[PDB]
Scaffold this motif. Structure first.
Motif, PDB file in Angstrom:
ATOM      1  N   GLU A 168     -57.382  21.833  20.550  1.00  0.00           N
ATOM      2  CA  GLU A 168     -55.969  21.871  20.168  1.00  0.00           C
ATOM      3  C   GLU A 168     -54.926  20.833  20.542  1.00  0.00           C
ATOM      4  OE1 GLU A 168     -57.556  24.503  21.457  1.00  0.00           O
ATOM      5  OE2 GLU A 168     -56.703  24.638  23.467  1.00  0.00           O
ATOM      6  N   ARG A 169     -54.788  20.409  21.774  1.00  0.00           N
ATOM      7  CA  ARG A 169     -53.711  19.415  21.962  1.00  0.00           C
ATOM      8  C   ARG A 169     -54.355  18.249  22.631  1.00  0.00           C
ATOM      9  NH1 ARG A 169     -52.527  24.417  23.531  1.00  0.00           N
ATOM     10  NH2 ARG A 169     -51.592  25.177  21.598  1.00  0.00           N
ATOM     11  N   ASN A 227     -56.221  14.588  12.655  1.00  0.00           N
ATOM     12  CA  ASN A 227     -55.728  13.312  12.160  1.00  0.00           C
ATOM     13  C   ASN A 227     -56.707  12.294  12.732  1.00  0.00           C
ATOM     14  OD1 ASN A 227     -54.247  11.278  11.030  1.00  0.00           O
ATOM     15  ND2 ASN A 227     -52.470  11.511  12.355  1.00  0.00           N
ATOM     16  N   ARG A 238     -57.716   8.508  13.389  1.00  0.00           N
ATOM     17  CA  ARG A 238     -57.016   7.244  13.546  1.00  0.00           C
ATOM     18  C   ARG A 238     -57.950   6.097  13.943  1.00  0.00           C
ATOM     19  NH1 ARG A 238     -55.193   9.647  18.153  1.00  0.00           N
ATOM     20  NH2 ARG A 238     -54.129   7.742  18.696  1.00  0.00           N
ATOM     21  N   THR A 282     -55.821   8.842   8.651  1.00  0.00           N
ATOM     22  CA  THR A 282     -56.015   9.643   7.461  1.00  0.00           C
ATOM     23  C   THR A 282     -54.723  10.409   7.170  1.00  0.00           C
ATOM     24  OG1 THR A 282     -56.828  11.449   8.876  1.00  0.00           O
ATOM     25  CG2 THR A 282     -58.474  10.087   7.800  1.00  0.00           C
ATOM     26  N   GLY A 283     -53.908  10.612   8.204  1.00  0.00           N
ATOM     27  CA  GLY A 283     -52.719  11.434   8.070  1.00  0.00           C
ATOM     28  C   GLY A 283     -53.258  12.833   8.398  1.00  0.00           C
ATOM     29  N   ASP A 338     -57.314  13.491  16.579  1.00  0.00           N
ATOM     30  CA  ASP A 338     -56.437  14.444  17.251  1.00  0.00           C
ATOM     31  C   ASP A 338     -56.664  15.833  16.676  1.00  0.00           C
ATOM     32  OD1 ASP A 338     -55.123  12.184  18.392  1.00  0.00           O
ATOM     33  OD2 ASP A 338     -53.831  12.064  16.639  1.00  0.00           O
ATOM     34  N   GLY A 339     -56.661  16.846  17.539  1.00  0.00           N
ATOM     35  CA  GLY A 339     -56.805  18.219  17.082  1.00  0.00           C
ATOM     36  C   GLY A 339     -55.394  18.789  17.092  1.00  0.00           C
ATOM     37  N   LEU A 340     -54.944  19.384  15.989  1.00  0.00           N
ATOM     38  CA  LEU A 340     -53.591  19.935  15.923  1.00  0.00           C
ATOM     39  C   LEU A 340     -53.549  21.363  15.406  1.00  0.00           C
ATOM     40  CD1 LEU A 340     -53.523  16.788  14.635  1.00  0.00           C
ATOM     41  CD2 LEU A 340     -51.109  17.235  14.600  1.00  0.00           C
ATOM     42  N   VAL A 341     -52.651  22.162  15.972  1.00  0.00           N
ATOM     43  CA  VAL A 341     -52.437  23.539  15.526  1.00  0.00           C
ATOM     44  C   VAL A 341     -50.955  23.617  15.160  1.00  0.00           C
ATOM     45  CG1 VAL A 341     -54.307  24.660  16.808  1.00  0.00           C
ATOM     46  CG2 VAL A 341     -52.063  24.321  17.904  1.00  0.00           C
ATOM     47  N   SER A 342     -50.600  24.511  14.243  1.00  0.00           N
ATOM     48  CA  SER A 342     -49.216  24.637  13.815  1.00  0.00           C
ATOM     49  C   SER A 342     -48.384  25.673  14.588  1.00  0.00           C
ATOM     50  CB  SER A 342     -49.157  24.902  12.311  1.00  0.00           C
ATOM     51  OG  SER A 342     -49.911  26.049  11.958  1.00  0.00           O
ATOM     52  N   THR A 343     -49.043  26.641  15.217  1.00  0.00           N
ATOM     53  CA  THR A 343     -48.350  27.666  15.997  1.00  0.00           C
ATOM     54  C   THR A 343     -48.295  27.225  17.460  1.00  0.00           C
ATOM     55  OG1 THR A 343     -49.092  29.479  14.557  1.00  0.00           O
ATOM     56  CG2 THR A 343     -48.398  30.059  16.784  1.00  0.00           C
ATOM     57  N   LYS A 344     -47.100  27.239  18.043  1.00  0.00           N
ATOM     58  CA  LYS A 344     -46.883  26.842  19.431  1.00  0.00           C
ATOM     59  C   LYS A 344     -47.815  27.597  20.382  1.00  0.00           C
ATOM     60  CE  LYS A 344     -42.334  25.467  20.027  1.00  0.00           C
ATOM     61  NZ  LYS A 344     -40.906  25.965  19.953  1.00  0.00           N
ATOM     62  N   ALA A 402     -56.677  11.074   0.318  1.00  0.00           N
ATOM     63  CA  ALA A 402     -56.011   9.925   0.827  1.00  0.00           C
ATOM     64  C   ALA A 402     -54.900  10.050   1.858  1.00  0.00           C
ATOM     65  CB  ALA A 402     -55.605   9.092  -0.371  1.00  0.00           C
ATOM     66  N   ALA A 403     -54.488   8.860   2.264  1.00  0.00           N
ATOM     67  CA  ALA A 403     -53.352   8.600   3.154  1.00  0.00           C
ATOM     68  C   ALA A 403     -52.527   7.743   2.187  1.00  0.00           C
ATOM     69  CB  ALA A 403     -53.797   7.745   4.369  1.00  0.00           C
ATOM     70  N   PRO A 456     -49.867   6.344   7.824  1.00  0.00           N
ATOM     71  CA  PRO A 456     -49.370   7.708   8.044  1.00  0.00           C
ATOM     72  C   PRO A 456     -48.948   7.904   9.507  1.00  0.00           C
ATOM     73  CG  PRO A 456     -51.297   7.763   6.684  1.00  0.00           C
ATOM     74  CD  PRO A 456     -51.227   6.374   7.250  1.00  0.00           C
ATOM     75  N   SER A 457     -48.005   8.807   9.733  1.00  0.00           N
ATOM     76  CA  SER A 457     -47.528   9.093  11.076  1.00  0.00           C
ATOM     77  C   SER A 457     -48.576   9.724  11.975  1.00  0.00           C
ATOM     78  CB  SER A 457     -46.345  10.051  11.025  1.00  0.00           C
ATOM     79  OG  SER A 457     -45.229   9.469  10.395  1.00  0.00           O
ATOM     80  N   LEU A 508     -48.700  12.326  14.255  1.00  0.00           N
ATOM     81  CA  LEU A 508     -47.949  13.518  14.662  1.00  0.00           C
ATOM     82  C   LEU A 508     -48.553  14.244  15.860  1.00  0.00           C
ATOM     83  CD1 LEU A 508     -47.281  15.132  11.165  1.00  0.00           C
ATOM     84  CD2 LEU A 508     -45.740  13.630  12.437  1.00  0.00           C
ATOM     85  N   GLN A 509     -47.713  14.941  16.623  1.00  0.00           N
ATOM     86  CA  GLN A 509     -48.182  15.687  17.786  1.00  0.00           C
ATOM     87  C   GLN A 509     -48.459  17.121  17.378  1.00  0.00           C
ATOM     88  OE1 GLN A 509     -48.039  12.282  19.428  1.00  0.00           O
ATOM     89  NE2 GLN A 509     -48.778  13.965  20.739  1.00  0.00           N
ATOM     90  N   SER A 510     -49.350  17.767  18.113  1.00  0.00           N
ATOM     91  CA  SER A 510     -49.703  19.153  17.861  1.00  0.00           C
ATOM     92  C   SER A 510     -48.646  20.084  18.467  1.00  0.00           C
ATOM     93  CB  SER A 510     -51.057  19.442  18.525  1.00  0.00           C
ATOM     94  OG  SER A 510     -51.451  20.802  18.394  1.00  0.00           O
ATOM     95  N   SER A 511     -48.604  21.317  17.971  1.00  0.00           N
ATOM     96  CA  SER A 511     -47.722  22.337  18.528  1.00  0.00           C
ATOM     97  C   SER A 511     -48.527  23.020  19.652  1.00  0.00           C
ATOM     98  CB  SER A 511     -47.326  23.368  17.466  1.00  0.00           C
ATOM     99  OG  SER A 511     -46.461  22.792  16.507  1.00  0.00           O
TER     100      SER A 511
END
Lengths: 141, 141, 141, 141, 141, 141, 141, 141
Positions: free
Chosen positions: C17-18, C57, C59, C72-73, C110-116, D1-2, D135-136, D138-141
Motif C-alpha cells: 500500500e504505501r 504506478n 515508473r 504509466t500513470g 508504487d502501490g496505491l490505495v484510495s481509502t485513507k 497509455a500514459a 504522468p504525475s 501521485l502519492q497513496s492515501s
C-alpha cells in the motif's frame, strides 16, 4: 506468448596443435549466469588469425552427445583474420534444457598441423555464438 | 539558426597487452583547442595492423560515465590494415558540454592477447572520430 | 559489426500500500549475471491482478537518477489480469554502462490505495523487460 | 497509455552586459507548481528588442550539467522584436525527473556587448519554452 | 579518403570610423587552436546593427596577400540587424596552409562614415566564417 | 550582393625579334585608372598580322609570379589578321588584389623568328583582355 | 588552341621514422627535363607496403608554400600493397610556372611510428603523379 | 564586334536639407579614370538610412542637359536601409561621349525636409550606377 530472446556471446582462445578446446556453457558469459532457461544454438561465427600455417576444425554438439553432429570441416589460417560461419540445420539443433551443466560442451575446436610433430604457431580464434533463449524457469515465493 | 559543424579528428596509438588506452578530449587536436563549445560523437573509425595475432575492443563513453555504453566487441588484428566503424545509437549519444575537462574519456581501447602472460606484438591503431559541434559560448567584452 | 542482443527478463512481486518496490539490475536474472555489458531499456510490459480494488504506478529511470523520467500513470487493478506497456521515448532511454551496480534502480512500482489507511488486498504484478545489450567488455589473458 | 502533455511557459528578463541570467525550473510558472512530474524540453522561442546594439547567446542544458550542450550562437538585437528558435536534437534532450529542484538551470542567456566596458542598453527578452510532461507521480492515501 | 571537415567560427567587433579591423586566424576560436591543418574559406556571413547611419566594407584575402581580392562593397547599417553573405569564387579561394601564422589576415572590415570627421555611432558586427579543413599534419612518436 | 563587373580593355604593340613585351596593369586603360579594386583575367583575344613570316607566344601570369602558367604556344603570323583566344582554367586564374602595382605583369608576348639573327618584319598585335572586377575598396570620410 | 598534355611520372622511396621525404620537381623524370613549361598537379596515387606496422601522411603543396594545403591524413601500412589517391580540389591546385626550380617541393611524405623511439621497418612507397602541362615557352632564333 | 562592357561604380554622400548633391563623371572611380570611352547609364540603385525623418529625390540627366529627365520622385528615409532602383527608358538614355568632362552631372539627389527651416538629421545615401561602356578611343603611335 513467451518471447524468445536472441543473444550473442563471445569467447576467444589460442589453439594448441594436437588438442581440442571445448567451449562449454560456462565459456559464454550470458549463458553462464542466466540461470534456469533453455537455449538453442542459432549460428556460430569463427574468426581466426595465425602467425604461420595452421588449421582448425570447429565442431557443433547436440545436448548430451559424446561427439559432434556438425562441423566447418578443416579450415586454413593465415596472417589476416578470416571468418567462417557454422549454421546447424534440422537435427543438429536440439535445445539445451535450462539446467544444462556449466561444463556441458556446445562447440569444440580442434587445432591441427600438417607436419608430423610440429607445434602450432601463435594464433587467436574468436568464437561468437548466437543463441535463442526460452523464458526463465522461475521459483515460487 | 545555429550552424552545427562536423569535424574529423585523428589520433594513433600502440596497444599494450593488459591495458586500456583512453582517448580523451585532449587526444583530438581540434576538440582540445576549440574552447567552450559542446560536441557529440557521430562515429568512430578504427583502423589497426599488427605484426602477429592481437585483439582489441573499442568502447564508447557517454559524458561523465565510469564505464562504456557501446563497444565494437573484440576484434582480431592481422598483418594488413583493417577498418571497423563504431556508430552510437540513441542513448549512447549524449552531448559533451563545452567545458568538458581535457582529461574526460570519450573512447577507450583495450589491448587483449589470448595466451596467458603473452606480450602484444608490434601494432598500430589509428582512431578517427567524427564530431558534431554546437556554437561557441563566447565571452562579452 | 557488433551485434546487439535483445533479451526479455521477468520478475514478479506483491505490491504493498504505501510503498514502492524497486526493480534493480539484480531483479532481472539475465542482467544480473551477464557481466560487464551495457544495456538499454526497450520496453516494459506490466501485468497485474488484484483480489479487490488497488492501483499502481510504474515508473522508469535513466541511469543514476534519483527520481523517474517516465511513468504509466496510475493504473487500476481488477480480478482479471490486465496488461500495460511502458515504452520510453528519446531522452528516457539512456544506456546503462556494463558495470552498473546490481542495486541500481531501473523501474519502480508504487502501490496505491484510495481509502485513507487501507491495506492493499492480495495482488500480483508480473514485470517483463525487453533489453538491448551491447557487446561484452572482456578481459585479456 | 500514459498521455504526455504539451505545455508552453513564458518568462521575460532584461539582460545585463557581462552576466548570464538563468532560467530555472521555477522561472516557468507551470513547471514550478506542477509537482512530481518529469518533463522534457521540446523547443524554446526567444524574442528580443534593444534600444541600441546588444548581443545575447541562449544556451540549453541537459539535467545536472554544469555547462550547456546547445546554443543559438551569438545573436544581435535591434530596435524591432526578432524571434529565434532553439530546438534540441538527440542527446541535448534528456528528460528532467519529476523531483528536479526548483533552482535547476534549464536555459541560460548571456548578455554581451562588443565595446570593452560598455553597459547594455535598455532591452527585453521574452523566452517561451515548450515542454513535454510525463504522468504525475501521485502519492497513496 | 581524407575526410574534409566543415566548421563555423564566429567573432564580433565594434567598428571604428576611419579604421579597418582585421579578422586573423587567431580571431576564430577553432582555427586558432586546431594545430597544423590547412583550411579554406567557404563563405562569410556578416551581420550588423548601428544606433545611427554607418557603413562597412568586408574584404576577403587570399593567403599572404597585402590587399583583398573580394569584397561585399560598401554596406549601410541601420537600427535593425541585417545580414550579408560573402562567398568567394574560383581564384579568391586559395587554401591557407596548416602552419599559417596566427596573425595572418583572412577578412578585413573597414568602418566608413559619410560626413567628414564624424565619429562612428555605437555598432556591433558579428562575423561567422564557414571553413573547410584538411586532415591534420600529425607528428611521429 | 556585390555586383562583379566585366570589362574589355585593349592595347596594341609591334613585336620585336628576341624580346618579350609585357602587358602590365597600366597597359590596360580601365585597369590603370580604376583605383583600389581587385580583378581577374577571364580571357584574352590576341589578333596579329605581319608583313612576312613571324611567330609569337602569348603567356599568362598569376599575380606575383616570375614566369607564366599558361600560354597559347607558338603561333604563326601571316599577311591577313588572325585571332587566337587564351582562356585560363582553374589555377591559372588567381585574382589580382586591388592595390596591384601598375607595373605588374599580366600577359607577356614573345616575338620569335626561325632564322638565326633575322629581324622581325613589320607587324602589329592587338590584345583585348576581358576582366572581372570586384567592388571598390572605398575610403571613409 | 594550345593542347594541354597529361603526363604520369613515378618515383619511389623508403620512408624513415621521424622524417619527411620531399618529392620535388626533379624527383619526377619528365618534369625534371622538360624545360620551361608550366604544370599542374591533377592527382597522386600513393602505393605502399611495409614489413611491420608503419604509417605515412602524404601532403600536397601549392607553388612556393612553406607548408602543405592538402593531405591524405595518416595511413597505415601492412604487408600487402595498398593504394591511396590524393586529388586536390579548387585552391590546392595552383599551377607551377615553367621555370619552377628543380628543388621546389610538390609532395611531401612523413614517416610515422606509434611507439616512442621505434625505428621504421623495411618499407617501400611508390608515388605516381598525374600532371597537366601547358605549352612550352620556346626561345627565338 | 566591339564588346560593350558593364561596370558597377559606387559613391556615397550625406544629404543636406535644401541642397542638391551632384554625382558627376568624376564621382564614379572607374568612369573617372577610364579615359576616352563612351558610356551609358543602365540603372542606378539608391540606398539610404536616416536617424530621423528625411526625404530625397534622385534625378537622372541626359548628357549636356541643365535639368533632369527622370526621377525617383520624393522618397522617405527611415532608420533601416531601404533600396530604390532608377531605370531610364528610351529617351532618358543618351550615351555620354568618351570625352565628357569630369564635372558633367549624371545624377543629382535633392535633400528635402517637410518642416520649414528644419535641418537634415544624420543620414547616408549609397549610389551604385551600372554603366555600359563602348570601346576605347585609342591614340596612334
Amino acid at each position: 506468448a513467451a518471447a524468445t530472446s536472441l543473444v550473442y556471446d563471445t569467447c576467444y582462445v589460442t589453439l594448441t596443435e594436437r588438442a581440442t578446446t571445448s567451449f562449454q556453457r560456462q565459456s559464454f558469459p550470458t549463458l553462464k549466469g542466466m540461470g534456469d532457461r533453455a537455449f538453442q544454438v542459432v549460428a556460430f561465427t569463427i574468426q581466426g588469425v595465425s602467425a604461420a600455417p595452421l588449421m582448425y576444425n570447429a565442431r557443433l554438439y547436440n545436448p548430451g552427445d559424446t561427439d559432434s553432429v556438425h562441423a566447418t570441416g578443416v579450415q586454413l589460417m593465415g596472417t589476416v583474420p578470416r571468418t567462417v560461419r557454422l549454421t546447424p540445420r534440422v537435427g543438429q539443433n536440439n535445445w539445451f534444457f535450462g539446467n544444462t551443466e556449466e561444463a556441458e560442451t556446445i562447440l569444440a575446436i580442434d587445432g591441427l598441423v600438417s607436419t608430423k610433430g610440429a607445434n602450432a604457431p601463435s594464433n587467436t580464434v574468436i568464437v561468437t555464438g548466437c543463441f535463442r533463449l526460452a523464458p526463465s524457469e522461475l521459483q515460487s515465493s
